[PDB]
């Protein structure tokens, strides 16, 4: 700021992040995909009208979260809600054919699914927060 106020050019990186990056490694970087934690997530909320992320006035009903280091899906289900209370979800029925009441979900994907149902939204959100702390995605 002082050099700008005097009016002389201040040479070098104004952003220190990549400056420290270059000073730290210098040589080329050898990486590994399996060591970097990449996570995917998907959200479903049941409500009378379209829920607004700017408000989030409706509860969250379906949580799914895939992690790459453990290549594992975590599924959170709420058994009861003000918009409707429902039973659990069975993996076997999902793998069945549509004509037989199934959902055609592949079995190999089902092999990597871990289920944790919760009765109320608060417990589900606590579990999601604590797993996020335990499993911090890159």
């Amino acid at each position: 700021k002082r050099m700008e106020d005097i009016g002389l050019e201040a040479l070098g990186m104004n952003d220190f992040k990549l400056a420290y990056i270059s000073d730290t490694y210098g040589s080329e970087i050898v990486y590994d995909r399996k060591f970097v934690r990449v996570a995917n997530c998907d959200i479903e909320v049941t409500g009378d009208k379209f829920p607004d992320p700017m408000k989030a006035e409706y509860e969250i009903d379906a949580i799914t979260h895939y992690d790459s280091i453990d290549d594992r899906f975590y599924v959170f289900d709420l058994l009861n809600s003000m918009y409707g209370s429902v039973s659990k979800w069975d993996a076997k029925l999902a793998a069945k054919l549509d004509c037989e009441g199934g959902d055609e979900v592949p079995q190999e994907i089902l092999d990597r699914v871990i289920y944790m149902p919760f009765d109320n939204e608060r417990d589900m959100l606590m579990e999601y927060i604590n797993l996020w702390e335990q499993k911090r995605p890159a």
Partner: protein, 69 residues
């Protein structure tokens, strides 16, 4: 006070740019007593008005001075 007819429209932007692209940035700032000159772009009346501000001297373009007074 540095004035002239339509000075902020042609004279200043032209002198500044020519000195910048012929002599360099350091020579261009020599005009400012405190070596501090800045360039802004105004998109009014088909834009293209690179109003130059020199810190230490006052630009008082005579065209608008006569227009409003």
């Amino acid at each position: 006070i540095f004035t002239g007819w339509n000075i902020e429209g042609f004279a200043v932007p032209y002198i500044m740019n020519r000195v910048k692209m012929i002599l360099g940035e350091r020579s261009m700032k020599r005009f400012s007593p405190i070596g501090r000159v800045k360039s802004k772009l105004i998109q009014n009346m088909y834009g293209s008005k690179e109003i130059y501000s020199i810190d230490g001297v006052s630009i008082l373009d005579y065209l608008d001075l006569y227009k409003k007074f």
